[PDB]
Every structure is written in C-alpha cells, then in structure tokens.
Design a protein around this ligand. Structure first.
Ligand SMILES: [Mg+2]
Ligand SMILES: [Mg+2]
Ligand SMILES: [Mg+2]
Ligand SMILES: [Mg+2]
Ligand SMILES: [Mg+2]
Ligand SMILES: [Mg+2]
Ligand SMILES: [Mg+2]
Ligand SMILES: [Mg+2]
Ligand SMILES: [Mg+2]
Ligand SMILES: [Mg+2]
Ligand SMILES: [Mg+2]
Ligand SMILES: [Mg+2]
Ligand SMILES: [Mg+2]
Lengths: 25, 97, 197, 127, 97, 214, 91
RNA sequence: GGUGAAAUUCUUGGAUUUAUUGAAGACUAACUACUGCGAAAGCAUUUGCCAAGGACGUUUUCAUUAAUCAAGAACGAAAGUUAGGGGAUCGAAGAUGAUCAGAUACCGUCGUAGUCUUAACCAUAAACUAUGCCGACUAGGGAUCGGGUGGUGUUUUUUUAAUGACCCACUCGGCACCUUACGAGAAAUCAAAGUCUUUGGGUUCUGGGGGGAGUAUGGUCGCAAGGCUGAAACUUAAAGGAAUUG
C-alpha cells in the first residue's frame, strides 16, 4: 500500500467527512 | 543507503539542469543524468565501400560519415547492454574504456 | 443611444461649394477631438483614417469596412470589433479579410475602411446584475425584452406550449425549409450541446 | 555525359522509401517502396524488401534517361528516431549494383533546435 | 545624461519656469536656451519656436512630458517649458545634444 | 496504359557564368500544350547542385549552391543564384566538444534591391604549446567576435550585388577578413559563412540575368 | 477607518446578485470611476462620461476609449501593429 | 501510419513519399562540461535598454555598525483554481484497437482539461547535499571558473612592440574531484559527517519505540482543492538503520 495513496484515500475520506458535517448543521 | 556520491548524475551547484528525451523510449531525463553515446557510423558500410566505388563519379570523392549525439535513459541503456552493470569497486572508475 | 460604441462627428469641407460637411463616424479607440482625420486613396496609415483595403498592408486592423465600394460601412461596426486583412489579389483587385465572426470574406480592394478598432471594447464583460439594467438597455433599442419562454405558454401561443410539465416535447432543432410559425428553437442547427470535444 | 538524378532514400522503421526525382527534386521518377514488393508487414523495413524496391526502381529508371543519381539518405527525423531504417542502406548498395551511377552521397535527416515535445509521456514508452 | 546637465543648471545657473516667464524672457533677449516638453501643445510649441527664431535662441526638445520636465528641473509640479537664463558650471549650451 | 513520360520534353539546365562550366544536367518536365501549359509552370523552380560540380575542384565538396530558374529560351532553363548552404556532415565535422561555437546573422541589403540573410559560424581554436584542453572564450570575446563579424558582414554587402557577391563567396575572402580582424580577440579554426538564404526578390531585371548567361 | 473588508464600492449592492458577480463588477467599476492621466495636458483629470468616452476636466479634450478603461489591451496592440506596418511601408 | 505481432485510421475524392511558398504556436538541439550565475525555486538563439550582484584590487571611507533568530514578512518547480487571450505539438478524463481468464493497466490511433501568456489565487515536492547558519583550527595532489601579481616565456598582428590568446610560478574567492584515514562513524562512508565520557566557540529549528496519524477537534489562511498549527482513546514487541553469508 503506497504511502501516496494512503494520502489520496485520506483526502477522499476527509472530503466526505466535512461534507456530511456541513450537511449535519 | 547512498549508492553514488554523485547520486546518479553530474550536478553539484545547480539544483536543476533541463529535461531531455531518451532515443529508445522517449523518457524525460535530466540532461546531466542521461547516458550520452557519440554514435559513430560510416556513411556506407565496411563492405559496400568498393561497391559504391565502382559506380561513383568523382573517384574517392569524400567518403563521408554520419554523426549524432544520442541520449539513453538508465533502463534502456542497461537493456540495450550499453553501460554493462559493474561491481562496487569498479563502478567508481570513470574512464571511457 | 442604443449603440455601445461612441460616435465621432467629423466635419469635412465640401469640394464643390463653400460649406462644411458634418459626417457621423463610429469613433475608433484613441481618436480624440481635434484630431485631423484623413480620407482617401493616398491617406496615411494612421488610426482613424479612411483608406481603401488595397491601400493598406497585410495584417492591418480596420473597422467600419465596406462590403462594396460606396455602401459607406458594413463590417466591424459594433464596439471593440475590427477586421483583419490577410492578403491581396492585385490582379482583378480583391482583398481577403477576416471578419469579427471568423468568416473569411473576399472584398474589392477599392472598398474603404477606418484604420484601427471600434471604441468601447469590453462593454459586455460587465454583468448587468439585475433586470432593470436590461430594462434601460432595451428601452433605447427595441421591444425585445423581457422574453417569456415558449414552454411557459399555452399550445395556442407557441409550438413549445402546453403539457402537464413544461417541456418542448419534440426536437427543438428546426429545418431551414420549415415555414414561419414553425421556426421556434434551434433553426438549421448543425449540432447542439455544450461546445466541448 | 551522365544525367544526374537525386535518389532521396527515406528509411524509417516498418518501411523504406526509395523515391528518385529529377535533378531539381520537383519531378518524380520511379518511387518504389519496400512494402509493395513483399507482403508480411514485418520485413517491409528489411534489407531484402528495399533491395527488391531498389532493383525495381532501376528498371523503371531505365528507358527514361536517368543514369546517375544524388544520394540523400534520410530517417524520420524531427522529433523521431533519426536512425535510418534497416532497409535504407541495402537500397543504396542494390541501386549501385544495378549499374546506375552515383554521386554526392549525403545524409538529409532533419535535425531541430528541440521543440514540439516528443511523444511518449514523461515516463516514456514502457511495455 | 541630459537630465544631469539640466539638474546642474538648477543648482548653479539661472533659469525660469513656465510659459508666461519664458516668453517674457525671450521678449527681452535674456534667454540662452529654452527646453520644450514633449506633450506641450503644438500651438504653444510653434509660438515658442517662433519667439526663439526672432530672438535667435536655441531650442531643445525634451523627450518627456511636462511631468518629467518638472522632475528633471527638480520641482514637484508640471513644467511645460524651461528657459535657461544663464548657464551654470554645465556644458548644456556648448553641446546641443 | 497512361505512361505520362511520353508527354515530356527533356529541357536543359544552365547555371550563371560567374562560375565554371554550366552543363549541370537535364531537366525533365512535360509538353507545353494547352490546358495549363508548361511554359509558365516551370518559372517557380529551385535546383540543388553542389558547388564542386560548378567549380571542378574537390575542396568545395560542401556549400551546395541552389539555383532558381528564370526563363525558358526554347529548349533551356536560365537560372540565377538562390541560396548557399553547407552539407550536413560538414556542420557535424566542425561541431566538436571542448570548443566554443559562435554564430552571427544579419539581414542585409546589396546595391540591388536584394534582401537575403547571411550566417557565420566560428569555432574557438587551441593554440600551439597549450596544456588547457577546452579553449573556451570569455563570453565578452563572443560578443566582441560577433560585433566584429556583424560589421564585416555588413560592409562586404551594401555594395556587392549578387553578380559580385558570389565572386566573393567562392574564394573564402570573407573568411580571410574575419580571421584577420578577430585573431587579436581569440584564435579561431573553422571560420565559415555556412548559409545564404534569399528572402525578397525584387523586380526581375532581365538585363541583369543576361550578364551571367553568356 | 476601513469601512468594508472586501466589497469596496460594491457595498451599495448589499447581499444580492452573488459574490462572484459583485466581485467581477467591482473590478470594472473601479476602472470605470477612476481618474486617468491626460496624454495631452499631462494632468490626472480624465473621467468617463459614457461608455467609450473619456474626457479631461481641464483642456476640454475627449478621447474615444474602452467601455471601462481609457485604453484596452487589444487596442494598444492594434496601435502598436498599425505603426510597425507604417514605418516599413514608409521605409 | 503504427506494432513483439496485429488490429483501429487514411488511401486511384491520389495516401505516404518529392519540390516551392506561407501561417500558427511552442522550444532553444549539436556547442553543453564532475563548467557559470542566482537566497532558493530556478536560469541556455540575437541585440538594445533599466536596475541589481559576487569575487578580485586598494597605502579610500565609517568604526562594532555584527551572528543567529520566536512574532512578523518577500520569493517559492509542477499540478491545480477564476477571467480573458492563445490553443502547433504533447496530453490526467473519455473513445477505440489489441494481448489476457478478466484489463475500466501497460502497447497502438485519436482526443476535452492542461501544456503558452496576462491579471489574480495556491504555497506544496525525494523543494535532497535526505547534511541549518556564522566563526576558528587540523592533510597531500592535480584540474578548472573569475579577479589579480611576476616573467629578460611562445603566437600572429607591421618580422619583434603594447594590449588580446596561450605557457610557467604565486595569490584570493568559487563549483568540484583524486589519494589517505590521521581523526570520526553501527557501518556505508566522511576534509567534515574531524578538533566529543581528555564531553563547553555563538546561535536557530527539530526528534524521544512502532502504529492510531499529520487523523479528530479548535483556530487561522484559501473561491476551491487544500495549507499551517495539531491531539487523545486504543493497540502493539518490535518497527527500523548499516553491513555479512546463503
Ligand atoms: Mg538499494
Ligand atoms: Mg530540484
Ligand atoms: Mg424567459
Ligand atoms: Mg400556463
Ligand atoms: Mg401547435
Ligand atoms: Mg541554441
Ligand atoms: Mg559557461
Ligand atoms: Mg514564522
Ligand atoms: Mg515539506
Ligand atoms: Mg528535508
Ligand atoms: Mg563557482
Ligand atoms: Mg522515549
Ligand atoms: Mg514516537
């Protein structure tokens, strides 16, 4: 598991995570 | 660990050079990192010289010869058996032959 | 009023009678009051001057260009517009030009043009921001604004009208041979959809 | 004496072009390629296809008037391989062997002041 | 190097600035040289040329507007024409350049 | 069958006489019948022949000369000078590592209304008894040589019509001028012009062509 | 004091029309209401009268310019290419 | 054309190939180097202009004005974002052609975004010498770049003077190299990575087993993508570095 794709998978996860939080306000 | 004190190239005091493209595979290469062979070929052959000699006006006109500076990438140079991978002691040698 | 570009009132002298002749030119960028404007075959290549298309070099930027020598201006008249000149055919004198739409027209070398670009360029780069600025723009042009959509109408008022949902219901690309009352939509359209490859 | 032509040999990979001209280049005489003499799509750059091409050029060259040529060996050039194909050099020897005369052998492969980025990608072509 | 010559006149020689004083200095023959700004109106430029033709006074054409001429003089206001009443230590009169 | 060879006339090539023999070869075109006759089509043609063909000696193996045909005097083609350029291997032979390369170009006008661009290539030379092994310049000598070259290459032109420009181009009298003027600045070994290219051809001047066609 | 952080002149529009449209309007309205250098009299006294009309409040000189600037970039380029054509014909 | 081989694509509506003429945009080959400049990123056709800079020289001037730096700032490859212009080539997305069990991968032909520019944003790279800066001292040699110095030294300039090019001997500053291991290091190796248990020249930043995790939260910056700052719960006995033998 390449480190640069850990970085990329985390950014998609973070994009989801603040999308749902902005929803949840 | 560090393999070469001159990491893989010839740059100490620049920080960048230019990109050049491999003749064999068109790969972008640092210009100081490319394996540069002065590809030397006679204009005709080692055999057809007399065959052109019998059919040429201007007897022994010039006998020209073609020049071109080729750039090889590291993978293509080794695959084409140009640099011929060396030992740990012998890779320090920088002599052309 | 009604035109984005400013107008230059240029006064000439009548060659055949003691009087002054006031012309109405579309002002070019950089032309000022008190500038001497020159119009003729031998006039100099300067911004605001009126020269025939054969008199100017290739690459010259011209405006208010005549389609035919003597129709007094037809091409590149709106604000910020111009005609490029891209070569001559001195035998049987024509002149190839580039129009503001990109069309490549061939015009006679005796057709005139004003050197430069029409003043007032960049006018459409500002958003009107609101309905009332479109109201005052078209108050001075004509009665074309506002525009009720055809799909918002009844079938009696439009081909697109009616339906239990607002929808065109048939291809909005209409043929060139279609009759008046049928051309509502995209007339003779070669293609549709967003310009993208 | 001798009616000089221009041989203008163009040797890429997958094909070789032996295109003889007039002495001014403009007028074409007997353009025969190696691909028209054989049907394998693999030897169309080979020496034998070009030899068959060069021999058939000399036949079409005769009864026309040209008896000598100017040799212009060329590869693809530009932003391409620039090394002449395997068929090009056989074509010269086959041309001389047919009996037609030679003069001013030259290489005319174009070389740029590098521009118009070479095809293949930054990582090159890897198979 | 012409601003350097003009600046040296200011600190050592005598001058007058503007138009009503340049013409009045041309009128009484107490002007050695007048310098006209580039963007000076041609009707005023031609009248200065005529006044300096009658008084037999050299005219220099500054390559700059009234703003740059006033700065070259060392002032903070636009100067259309400067009349050099007397040279200082400079060679501005000797070298028409 | 079609065989468009049978409809061809086999014209001839004649060089300018500011050279040795002009029997360049045989042009082969067409028959000048109606429906876009070949009398006018052959006007716009340039031919490529080596200089050593038009001078005999083998020292001029490089700098091939281009000739532009002008008129057809029945069975002929009358040509004027079009351009000079070296052969490819001559540039490759002179271009070597461990030496500076100096190049200079000016677009210059002759006494005629001729507009044509001229180059000049210079290669720095190792002097005798030298132990330094790259012979590079000081990057102000490069601009000094280039400035000297541009003055020399502008003074030799602006007299010197193409009738007499070719008579200075062949004997390397320009190279003598460059070496005799630049040798105080840096030693040089391969001084050449390497390229003559013609940009704007003026009115035809049929009389001027006839001088070079005896 | 700095009355607004970023809206500037576009504070007259309140909160409507969209931030991007007000921002695009801000760039062109700052040019439109600016004061430009008179090329004739040298003063900074040129103010727009109408779109394409730029007038100096001294020396009473009107020039035909762009809709929101005295001079547009494409027109300086046109003026630069017209003059370059002129010397070479005059040469 | 293209390929390991093909397919797709074009073609007696003339392809490819040959010649003349142009247009457009991009780039600056060969020369080009264990060479130069720049704080770094970076910077390679020509000339002109503008402002700057290092070194060298000095028997010029001031006389501690300095070193390093929280906070605070300027610049910062590529990609990417907004709005124009430009849009040749190449080419994330996508189409299609193959191989393959499958291939939405490699290979092949196209091809939008982008690649180019302007005005703004972003502020990240294996942004690396993975080596902070300033200062002193410790070992031998050659080569080179720039400045300087001295030769009863060569080279044509007119036969030789000057000056330029070159040679030799010194010097300073710079990019570097070769040998050796005094000394150092876990070693690889290192003239610094030496002058450290015989431990102390000045100073800034950073690390405290591996993961969780550059995550969560808060604050701040950004239009956005995201940047900067930055945990804990819990989990785990190794992870890891260098070298030896197979
Ligand atoms: Mg390894
Ligand atoms: Mg880097
Ligand atoms: Mg509506
Ligand atoms: Mg209704
Ligand atoms: Mg109906
Ligand atoms: Mg170059
Ligand atoms: Mg250098
Ligand atoms: Mg800080
Ligand atoms: Mg970082
Ligand atoms: Mg780091
Ligand atoms: Mg250095
Ligand atoms: Mg710990
Ligand atoms: Mg830890």
């Amino acid at each position: 598991m390449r480190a640069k794709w850990r970085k990329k998978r985390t950014r998609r996860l973070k994009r989801k995570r603040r999308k749902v939080r902005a929803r949840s306000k | 660990p560090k393999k070469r004190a001159s990491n893989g190239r010839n740059k100490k005091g620049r920080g960048h050079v230019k990109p050049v493209r491999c003749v064999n595979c068109s790969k972008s290469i640092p210009k100081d990192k490319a394996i540069k062979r002065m590809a030397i070929r006679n204009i005709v052959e080692a055999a057809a010289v007399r065959d052109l000699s019998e059919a040429s006006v201007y007897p022994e006109y010039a006998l020209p010869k073609t020049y071109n500076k080729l750039h090889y990438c590291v993978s293509c140079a080794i695959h084409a058996r140009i640099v011929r991978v060396r030992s740990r002691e012998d890779r320090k040698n920088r002599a052309p032959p | 009023s009604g035109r984005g570009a400013p107008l230059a009132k240029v006064v000439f002298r009548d060659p055949y009678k003691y009087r002054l002749r006031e012309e109405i030119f579309i002002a070019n960028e950089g032309v000022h009051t008190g500038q001497f404007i020159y119009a003729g075959k031998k006039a100099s290549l300067n911004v605001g001057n009126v020269l025939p298309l054969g008199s100017v070099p290739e690459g010259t930027i011209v405006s208010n260009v005549e389609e035919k020598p003597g129709d007094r201006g037809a091409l590149a008249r709106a604000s910020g517009n111009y005609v490029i000149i891209i070569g001559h055919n001195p035998d049987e004198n024509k002149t190839r030009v580039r129009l503001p739409s990109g069309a490549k027209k061939v015009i006679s070398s005796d057709a005139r043009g004003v050197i430069g670009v029409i003043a007032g360029g960049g006018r459409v780069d500002k958003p009107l921001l609101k309905a009332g600025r479109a109201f005052h723009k078209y108050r001075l042009k004509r009665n074309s604004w506002p525009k009720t959509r055809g799909v918002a109408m009844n079938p009696v008022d439009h081909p697109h009208g009616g339906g239990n949902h607002q929808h065109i219901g048939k291809a909005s690309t209409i043929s060139r041979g279609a009759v008046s009352g049928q051309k509502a939509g995209l007339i003779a359209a070669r293609r549709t959809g967003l310009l993208r490859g | 004496s001798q009616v000089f032509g221009v041989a203008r040999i163009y040797a890429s990979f997958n094909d070789t072009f032996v295109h003889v001209t007039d002495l001014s280049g403009k007028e074409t005489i007997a353009r025969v390629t190696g691909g028209m003499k054989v049907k394998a799509d693999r030897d169309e750059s080979s020496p034998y296809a070009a030899m068959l091409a060069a021999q058939d050029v000399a036949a079409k060259c005769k009864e026309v008037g040209i008896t000598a040529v100017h040799v212009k060996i060329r590869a693809t050039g530009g932003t391409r391989t620039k090394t002449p194909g395997p068929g090009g050099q056989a074509a010269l020897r086959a041309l001389a062997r047919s009996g037609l005369r030679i003069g001013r052998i030259e290489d005319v492969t174009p070389v740029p002041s590098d521009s118009t980025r070479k095809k293949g990608g930054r990582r090159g072509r890897r198979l | 190097s012409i601003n350097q010559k003009l600046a040296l006149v200011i600190k050592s020689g005598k001058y007058t600035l503007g138009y009503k004083s340049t013409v009045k200095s041309l009128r009484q023959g107490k002007s050695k040289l007048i310098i006209i700004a580039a963007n000076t109106p041609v009707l005023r430029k031609s009248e200065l040329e005529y006044y300096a033709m009658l008084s037999k006074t050299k005219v220099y054409y500054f390559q700059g507007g009234n703003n740059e001429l006033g700065t070259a003089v060392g002032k903070l206001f636009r100067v259309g024409v400067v009349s050099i009443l007397e040279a200082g230590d400079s060679d501005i009169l000797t070298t028409l350049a | 069958v079609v065989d468009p060879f049978t409809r061809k006339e086999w014209f001839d090539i004649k060089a300018p006489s500011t050279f040795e023999n002009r029997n360049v070869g045989k042009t082969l075109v067409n028959k000048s019948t109606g429906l876009k006759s070949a009398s006018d089509a052959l006007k716009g043609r340039v031919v490529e022949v080596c200089l050593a063909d038009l001078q005999g000696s083998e020292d001029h193996s490089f700098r091939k000369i281009k000739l532009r045909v002008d008129e057809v005097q029945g069975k002929n083609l009358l040509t004027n000078f079009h351009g000079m350029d070296f052969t490819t291997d001559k540039l490759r032979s002179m271009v070597r590592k461990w030496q500076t390369l100096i190049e200079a170009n000016v677009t210059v006008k002759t006494s005629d209304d001729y507009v044509l661009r001229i180059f000049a290539i210079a290669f720095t030379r190792k002097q005798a008894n030298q132990v330094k092994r790259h012979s590079y310049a000081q990057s102000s000598h490069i601009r000094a040589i280039r400035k000297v070259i541009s003055e020399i290459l502008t003074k030799e032109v602006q007299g010197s019509t193409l009738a007499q420009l070719t008579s200075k181009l062949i004997p390397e009298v320009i190279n003598k001028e460059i070496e005799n003027a630049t040798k105080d600045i840096f030693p040089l070994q391969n001084i050449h012009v390497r390229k003559v290219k013609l940009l704007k051809q003026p009115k035809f001047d049929v009389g001027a062509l006839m001088a070079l066609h005896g | 004091a700095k009355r607004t952080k970023k809206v500037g002149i576009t504070g007259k529009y309140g909160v409507r029309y969209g931030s991007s449209l007000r921002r695009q309007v801000k760039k062109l309205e700052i040019q439109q209401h600016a004061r430009y250098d008179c090329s004739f009299c040298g003063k900074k006294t040129v103010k727009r009268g109408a779109a394409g009309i730029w007038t100096c409040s001294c020396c009473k000189k009107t020039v035909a310019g762009g809709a929101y600037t005295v001079s547009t970039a494409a027109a300086a380029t046109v003026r630069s290419t017209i003059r370059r054509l002129r010397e070479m014909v005059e040469a």
